[PDB]
Amino acid sequence: GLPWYRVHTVLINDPGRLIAAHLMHTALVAGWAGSMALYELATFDPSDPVLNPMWRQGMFVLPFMARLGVTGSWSGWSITGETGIDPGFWSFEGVALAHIVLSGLLFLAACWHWVYWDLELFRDPRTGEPALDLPKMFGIHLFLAGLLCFGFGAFHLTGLFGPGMWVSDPYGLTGSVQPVAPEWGPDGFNPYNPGGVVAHHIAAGIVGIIAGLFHILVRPPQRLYKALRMGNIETVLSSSIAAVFFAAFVVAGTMWYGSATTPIELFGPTRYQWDSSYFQQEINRRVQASLASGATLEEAWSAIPEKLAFYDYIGNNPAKGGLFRTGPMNKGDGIAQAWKGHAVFRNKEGEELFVRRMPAFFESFPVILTDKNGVVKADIPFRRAESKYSFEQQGVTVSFYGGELNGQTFTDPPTVKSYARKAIFGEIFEFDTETLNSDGIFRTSPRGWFTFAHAVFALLFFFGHIWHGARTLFRDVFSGIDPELSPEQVEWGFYQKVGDVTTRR
Amino acid sequence: MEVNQLGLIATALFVLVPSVFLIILYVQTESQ
């Protein structure tokens, strides 16, 4: 009988039941989407988009809803934190219900196509055999795809008839769904320009309509039909898989480096923002300018929004997780409550000292303080007996500007050391570790989990492409080579051209 | 709610095990 790994090949020449399988797959996917959202809503806390945004809570579908403009709940809250809204039907809840109704309706259609498999439509009128004209199917579906792609960019993203998409400032502080105008010049190919996304869909949609029209009207060349086995639906599976893993790599890449469509309020910061100290530069630009403009130290740092300070903390760096450290980032370091303040270390000579920040590569990292020039002036020693830079010896103190501890100074060595231990993580925050029984170990963000899954699936689908393409091109020997292959076709020199039996000498 | 978290596994197995028994017996019936 069939081996287990081949049970679904019974659909290869059964267009009706193929459609029924595909319907059932689509139902299951739409059902998952609905089920995932509903779980996420049952567990999401909307009370603090500053220090407990969705990306800290292990929300995975919510940001994709928010990306395209679904931002409120029937409960009256919104993800931007405004209260009193009415979102209308297309709330998170309503999106979830629609996908569930869709899943239900797909499920019935599947039943019907499974029972009434033998539609005359699927029969070649010349032979009576089942037959799909795949070249024309491509033109039709391509045309449909072009229409939808065009409409998505022309009406949804622009706001002509739709909500727009999530946009923000460069530091992820004031995001919202806004209509977006197409950028038609060369900066539309910049991944960080949201208008490029509008232009892309409008232009590519039109190209898809034209190609669609081409592929409906113009028949494939004989040379290409035979080379690509266009009578064989498995050549479509092969090239379709290829296209899917291409796309999967792209979306993993843009998720990891970041683009206009992976904004940091929905997915969290990138690791590169930590590498380059993106937020620390900006924060210092603001303090520096608060101070030139008169303000005191207390005042310059109290001016730093907590949301910006919280980006400048390695626990939101997606490259700090672990494969089996499960769940929301809040399960690790806890639920962020408050910025404690910016910590300023001085030695006994009043020199300002800087904690060397932990790089993402390091699970643990030592505590080393430096002056503005990079010279080591204090550390926490491992071996004490020859230590020369201890906090005790260098009389290190920590003062706090802004936040909860603003205007407080600590001199007792164990306390100073303790904030030094945290300052390697960047800015210092107060966490609630009890509410989730947080274990204190960093986890990755949705940006991390999504990249991992899609890069892995992409690589696996590459093997799918190879398998099914081999199967398309070698269908005639799938079961084995010809038992009357003769040694003359395989031994050398017999034929001038390999395998070409017309080229003997 | 502070429920017994062995209740999940007990409910799960309570369903899975006898149902699998039933299915195994039905499918081998259909193939003879």
Binding site: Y39, C111 | M1, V3, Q5, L8, T11, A12
Partner: peptide
Amino acid sequence: METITYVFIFACIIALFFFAIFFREPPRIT
């Protein structure tokens, strides 16, 4: 977890109903 579990079992039964009506052994007149 307990809500999901109660809902899942209820949902399995509704699916049993469907198969037991529409995919029953047809009664036939031997």
